[PDB]
Amino acid sequence: VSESFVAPLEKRAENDVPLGNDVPIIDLQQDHLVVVQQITKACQDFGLFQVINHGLPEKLMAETMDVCKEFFALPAEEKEKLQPKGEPAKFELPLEQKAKLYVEGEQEAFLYWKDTLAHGCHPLDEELVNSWPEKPATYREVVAKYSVEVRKLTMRILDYICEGLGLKLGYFDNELSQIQMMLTNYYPPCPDPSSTLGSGGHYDGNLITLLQQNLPGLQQLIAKWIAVEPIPTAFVVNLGLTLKVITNEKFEGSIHRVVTNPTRDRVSIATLIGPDYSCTIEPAKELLSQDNPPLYKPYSYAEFGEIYLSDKSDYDAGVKPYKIN
Ligand SMILES: CN1[C@H]2C[C@H](OC(=O)[C@H](CO)c3ccccc3)C[C@@H]1[C@@H](O)C2
Numbered sequence: 001v002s003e004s005f006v007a008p009l010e011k012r013a014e015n016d017v018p019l020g021n022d023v024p025i026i027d028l029q030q031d032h033l034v035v036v037q038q039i040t041k042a043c044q045d046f047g048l049f050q051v052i053n054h055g056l057p058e059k060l061m062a063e064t065m066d067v068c069k070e071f072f073a074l075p076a077e078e079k080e081k082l083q084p085k086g087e088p089a090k091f092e093l094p095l096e097q098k099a100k101l102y103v104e105g106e107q108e109a110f111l112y113w114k115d116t117l118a119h120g121c122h123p124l125d126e127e128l129v130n131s132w133p134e135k136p137a138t139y140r141e142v143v144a145k146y147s148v149e150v151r152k153l154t155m156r157i158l159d160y161i162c163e164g165l166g167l168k169l170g171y172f173d174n175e176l177s178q179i180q181m182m183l184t185n186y187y188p189p190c191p192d193p194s195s196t197l198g199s200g201g202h203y204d205g206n207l208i209t210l211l212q213q214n215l216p217g218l219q220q221l222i223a224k225w226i227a228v229e230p231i232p233t234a235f236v237v238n239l240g241l242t243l244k245v246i247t248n249e250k251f252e253g254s255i256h257r258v259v260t261n262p263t264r265d266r267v268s269i270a271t272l273i274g275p276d277y278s279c280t281i282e283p284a285k286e287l288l289s290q291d292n293p294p295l296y297k298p299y300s301y302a303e304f305g306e307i308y309l310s311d312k313s314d315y316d317a318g319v320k321p322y323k324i325n
Pocket residue numbers: 091095104181183199202203204205206270272274304305308309
């Protein structure tokens with residue numbers, strides 16, 4: 001591989017990472033209180049769980065994975081239309097909601113073995129959808145339906161979380177969930193998986209992420225890494241660094257990475273829901289007391305975002321400046 005993609009020695013993945021047998025698989029068609037309790041325990045203990053029987057159509061999940069794979073099979077001349085000034089965009093503020101192809105890495109500077117298509121999904125209007133990929137022909141109609149369905153499921157999970165925390169229903173149905181970035185991640189085959197990463201170890205900086213995968217490669221940090229079993233009809237729920245802050249660390253954030261594969265490509269669909277850049281983030285005042293003092297001072301999501309996207313010296317570098325008590 002090009003030296004551009006060689007990860008620092010300490011960040012390289014070991015060849016045989018064990019399956020995470022303790023990753024919760026939560027059936028959302030259980031009794032209401034059982035679902036609230038199981039989600040609450042997974043959020044407190046792990047910060048990563050899968051949901052099944054989640055009410056999002058399996059056919060739509062398959063059609064969305066199909067059109068996302070079809071997008072990454074498009075020729076160079078079509079993909080260039082999503083490369084501003086002839087190169088992929090960078091994950092840096094301002095992060096526009098129009099569709100672009102993105103490159104990503106860490107500044108021992110290296111690049112992740114990944115192409116990412118990203119666009120906003122909420123609210124859906126003509127202007128936003130007209131800024132999505134023109135090809136494949138069905139991308140806009142399928143992904144518009146998918147984005148509405150994934151948002152509906154995310155808001156159901158956030159209300160289960162509200163009941164678990166003792167927050168009013170709809171606590172996150174406001175500025176805290178107004179940005180919905182859909183990241184379609186393409187991991188092409190890699191000649192040297194021992195030296196590369198599809199995605200470096202990170203928290204998602206946002207509130208909550210729903211991740212759809214068909215193939216292995218996702219791993220979670222529990223300094224032990226475990227493999228997250230791909231269930232093609234499930235969503236992986238990753239709690240974001242923003243939710244870790246708002247719950248005053250009552251909930252864990254998911255630290256996860258993606259390893260490369262020597263033989264096969266892989267596509268994942270990540271729906272990253274979180275605050276507008278104008279939001280102030282702080283521990284929910286409703287949950288604080290002398291027994292539970294705030295562990296973070298209030299901060300600008302925009303200010304956090306700049307650090308989160310630039311400084312990868314530690315997983316929570318984004319929130320370190322705002323730590324108190
Ligand atoms: C692997 N990378 C991580 C960092 C960056 O994330 C973002 O770009 C999100 C997009 O919502 C963001 C979150 C919070 C603040 C700023 C940006 C791009 C991708 C994501 O999959 C997660």
